[PDB]
Amino acid sequence: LYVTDIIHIYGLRRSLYDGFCMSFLTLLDQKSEAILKPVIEKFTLGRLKNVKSIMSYIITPFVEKNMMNLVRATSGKRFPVLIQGPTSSGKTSMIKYLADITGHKFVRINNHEHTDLQ
Amino acid sequence: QNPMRDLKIEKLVLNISVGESGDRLTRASKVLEQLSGQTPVQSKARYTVRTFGIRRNEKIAVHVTVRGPKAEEILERGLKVKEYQLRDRNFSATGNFGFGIDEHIDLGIKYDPSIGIFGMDFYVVMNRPGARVTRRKRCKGTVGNSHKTTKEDTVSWFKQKYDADVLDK
Amino acid sequence: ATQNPPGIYGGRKILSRAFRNRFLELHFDDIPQDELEIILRERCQIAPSYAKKIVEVYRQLSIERSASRLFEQKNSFATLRDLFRWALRDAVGYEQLAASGYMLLAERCRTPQEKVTVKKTLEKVMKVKLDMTKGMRRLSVLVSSCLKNKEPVLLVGETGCGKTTICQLLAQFMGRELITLNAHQNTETGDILGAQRPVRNRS
Amino acid sequence: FLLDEISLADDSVLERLNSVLEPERSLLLAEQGSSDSLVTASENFQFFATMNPGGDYGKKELSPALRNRFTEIWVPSMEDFNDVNMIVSSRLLEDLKDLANPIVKFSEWFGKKLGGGNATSGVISLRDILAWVEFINKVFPKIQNKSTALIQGASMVFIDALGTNNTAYLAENENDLKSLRTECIIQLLKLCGDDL
């Protein structure tokens, strides 16, 4: 559902690394992900012989470009993205800081321990 | 001998080089003003440089000269910053001396983010009574040999009152 | 979605396997000190000692004693937004950094032993960062002067130890609503909504 | 929002305060006047109140996100040389000022010994010293009445704070060498004779 998210006849051979690393390397809780992008990074490089014309508070460089493309496509495609990291590291500021670029609405909710299905 | 050949400070001259005109210079100026109470003076580039990005007559630096008591305050005040340690150079063969400080805040003076942070230098020129002979209009003279300020004599002066240290060989 | 790691914090439950297949994994770490050092420091007049010591001291103090299961004091916890409140209010450095930073991470301890090392270690970095009682009076002026300026101030400690003087003096000195409420063992989320409604007038 | 015992509550109460300053809303919807209408937004809703810690008896520990957003005031209990004496000197100055020195010396030592994890009346603080020092303002004019009343007034909660004065049962490797009231009652003979 990721490779079909972004269409190009040079991005199809480079979408395998991002699509295969978007759900596995960033979803890992341990340190067993440092040796899995070596084969995908070397296997998903320069291999497409083209056609298609390359057509369709603080502020960090990792959340203003490294989480905008994946967050915009993942949030616009219709998928439930999860924020993994420290408590108050900037996981709630990424949506509000990345929702000012496109026409979308963000609602910050604070759930407790009494949040069941009912 | 010694009576009347004491060793006053002639003048302290603080100086700010800024490879440009505009805001960043009028701010350097603002610094020197509030710090001296005297309105400071601007200096134009003497020739054009390019690798320094300046043109002849650009207005490139301000400075201000300060004399008596007020001089001694700012001297000591920035002399503090320098932990009362100069060096054996720093003193001229004609017996004056200077130092630089960066960060003009390390000597009173708040921050204000619409002002920025500038250095804190300034030379100290020393003399004795009767300096006027070499400076008035009529009968302009040069001061006698055994009256001229020297390096030895000024260092020893500094080492004394202030108590500060000289350093190096 | 958002939260913390299950392997990091003890007592946390893992997610479902059916919801893990349709859930996108978005990794988001904390910001750097270089991107937060330009915001904490107004201009170049304050110096880089405050911005560098504020991030270096908080980065080592926050990592040396977190609120997890590996750290000692769980009450002491700071973030990236906690340094902006202490850095933005401290425009004039010199001796206000220790008093303004002693009630941030050093005031989150239990006793004086946990605040002595944090206050001494955090206040000892100011002398090395720049080349160049008192504890109650240093926090009494900043707390009373910062309490009238706004902000959610919390007074933790023993009952009747001196937490009623700040609330009574601050509430009696300024003109507020005066919404006093005595919480007990049966004070849930309905106490605020039930106690906040028909208070002021409504008759 | 003045809250006294807000840290003594159980589950609930921190969800609204933790989302009223961070999220800017009153939880996940208002209980009164909710449904599918207007939402509860907070643009000018501040919060100012104190409370206790999470290490106290009957008190719950707060979250790191709710405690990291607000300024924590570093103010614990008073000392036993100026706080206990100055806080116990008021009211007991009309009776005996020489009997207020041994009352604050044995109240600070036992208070750090008798925890509140055992019984509900096992916890001590300023209420025990203030109540014990304010409840012993009217006694006899001799040293026997003041010493016996002052030494028998603080015991009402010292010897009554324990679950039992002594226990005897057939255990395996468990032998009681001393009681639980002898250690707290053996300091009265030395404190009553040392001060008085």
DSSP letter string over B120-158?
Answer: --EEEEE--TTGGGGTSSTT-----GGGS--HHHHHHHH
CA distance C99 to C90: 10
CA distance D139 to D149: 7
The answer to whether residues A80 and C23 touch, using CB atoms and an 8 Å cutoff, is yes
Check CB contact under 8 Å for D68 and C156.
Answer: no
**Among D97, D101, D91, D98, which residue's Cα sits nearest to residue D135?**
D91
Which H or E run includes C27? Answer: strand C24-27
Residue A24 C-alpha, separation from nearest chain C C-alpha, in angstroms: 8
Which chain C residues are Cβ-neighbours of B112 within 8 angstroms?
A: 42-43, 45
Which chain C residues are Cβ-neighbours of A85 within 8 angstroms?
A: 4-5, 27-30
CA distance C112 to C182: 29
Determination method here?
Answer: cryo-EM
Binding site listing of C: 157-164
The answer to whether residues D105 and D195 touch, using CB atoms and an 8 Å cutoff, is yes
**Among B46, B47, B48, B38, which residue's Cα sits nearest to residue B14?**
B38
**What is the phi-psi region of residue D173: left when phi exceeds 0, alpha when psi lies from -120 to 50, beta otherwise?**
left
Token pair in block for residue D77: 């209990």
CA distance D25 to D51: 23
The experimental resolution of this structure, in angstroms, equals: 9.5
CA distances from B139 to B10, C111, D5, D70 (A): 21, 79, 90, 76
**The length of chain B, given as a count of residues:** 169
**Among C36, C29, D116, B18, which residue's Cα sits nearest to residue A83?**
C29
Check CB contact under 8 Å for C46 and B117.
Answer: yes
Q: Is the CA virtual torsion D9, D15, D16, D21 positive or negative?
A: positive
The answer to whether residues D64 and C169 touch, using CB atoms and an 8 Å cutoff, is no
The owner of tokens 């206000």 is: C96
> Which chains form contacts with chain C, at 3 or more CB pairs under 8 Å?
A, B, D
Mark out chain A residues that contact chain C at CB-CB < 8 A.
22-27, 29-30, 57-63, 67, 70-71, 74, 79-92, 94, 112
CA distance C162 to D75: 7
CA distance A102 to A55: 19
3-class SS letters over chain D: CEECCCCCCCCCCHHHHHHHCCCCECCCCCCCCCCCCCCCECCCCCCCEECCCCCCCCCCCCCHHHHHCCEECCCCCCCCCCHHHHCCCCCCCCCCCCCCCCCCCCHHHHHCCCCCCCCCCCCCCHHHHHHHHHCCCCCCCCHHHHHHHHHHHCHHHHCCCCCCCCCCCCCCCCCCCCCCCHHHHCCHHHHHHHCC
CA distance D3 to D50: 6
**Among C167, C141, C144, which residue's Cα sits nearest to residue C155?**
C167
Is A46 assigned a ligand-binding role in the annotation?
Answer: no
Instruction: Fill in the DSSP letter of residue C65.
Output: S
CA distance D170 to B26: 91
CA distance A76 to A97: 16
The owner of tokens 């993942």 is: A74
The answer to whether residues C178 and C139 touch, using CB atoms and an 8 Å cutoff, is no
Query: Which A residues, 60 through 99, put their C-beta within 8 Å of a C-beta on chain D?
Result: 87-88, 92
Check CB contact under 8 Å for A110 and D25.
Answer: yes
The answer to whether residues C152 and D46 touch, using CB atoms and an 8 Å cutoff, is yes
**Which residue is closest to C68 within chain D, CA to CA?**
D64
CA distance B141 to D151: 96
**Number of Cβ atoms within 10 Å of the Cβ of C142:** 18
Residues 6+ apart with CB under 8 A from D7: C156, D51, D52, D53, D54, D56, D59, D60, D62
CA distances from A85 to A27, A57, A73, B145, C13 (A): 10, 19, 21, 77, 16
Long-range contacts of D146-153 (CB under 8 A, 24+ apart): D146/D96, D146/D99, D147/D99, D147/D192, D147/D196, D150/D99, D150/D102, D150/D103, D151/D188, D151/D191, D151/D192
Tell me the β-bridge partners of B85. Answer: B165
**Among C57, D65, C190, D147, which residue's Cα sits nearest to residue A90?**
D65
Instruction: Fill in the DSSP letter of residue B92.
Output: -
CA distances from D94 to B45, C49, C58, D90, D139 (A): 83, 56, 51, 9, 12
Residue B83 C-alpha, separation from nearest chain C C-alpha, in angstroms: 7
Tell me the β-bridge partners of B61. Answer: B17, B43
**Among C78, C73, C68, which residue's Cα sits nearest to residue C9?**
C68
Query: Which D residues, 2 through 31, put their C-beta within 8 Å of a C-beta on chain C?
Result: 2-13, 15-17, 21, 26-27, 30-31
CA distance A21 to D11: 39
**Number of Cβ atoms within 10 Å of the Cβ of D179:** 15
The answer to whether residues D110 and D69 touch, using CB atoms and an 8 Å cutoff, is no
Interchain CB contact of D64 with A (< 8 Å): yes
Q: What angle, 0 to 180 degrees and rounded to 10, lies between the N-to-C axes of helices B70-81 and B23-36?
A: 120
CA distance B78 to B81: 5
Taking the CA of residue A89 as centre, how many other CA atoms within 13 Å lie in the half-sphere pointing to its CB? Answer: 19
The answer to whether residues D107 and D188 touch, using CB atoms and an 8 Å cutoff, is no
Which H or E run includes C56? Answer: helix C48-64
Does D touch C (3+ CB pairs < 8 Å)? Answer: yes
The torsion angles phi and psi of C200, rounded to 5 degrees, stand at: -80, 120
Check CB contact under 8 Å for D2 and C171.
Answer: yes
- The C-alpha torsion from D115 through D119 and D123 to D129, rounded to 10°, is -120
**Among D194, D196, D195, D167, which residue's Cα sits nearest to residue D180?**
D167
The answer to whether residues C59 and C82 touch, using CB atoms and an 8 Å cutoff, is no
The answer to whether residues B126 and B10 touch, using CB atoms and an 8 Å cutoff, is yes
Helix (H, G, I), strand (E, B) or coil at B16: strand
Instruction: Fill in the DSSP letter of residue B116.
Output: -
Check CB contact under 8 Å for C24 and A80.
Answer: yes
Q: In chain D, what is the straight-line distance between the N-terminal and C-terminal CA atoms, in Å?
A: 48
The answer to whether residues C184 and D8 touch, using CB atoms and an 8 Å cutoff, is yes
Helix (H, G, I), strand (E, B) or coil at C192: helix
Q: How far is CA D69 from the centre of its chain?
A: 26
Whole-angstrom Cα Rg for chain B? 18
Q: What angle, 0 to 180 degrees and rounded to 10, lies between the N-to-C axes of helices C164-173 and C134-147?
A: 40
CA distance C79 to C66: 11
Q: Is the CA virtual torsion C162, C167, C168, C169 positive or negative?
A: positive
Instruction: Fill in the DSSP letter of residue B90.
Output: S
The owner of tokens 């320094």 is: B52
Token pair in block for residue C200: 């002021």
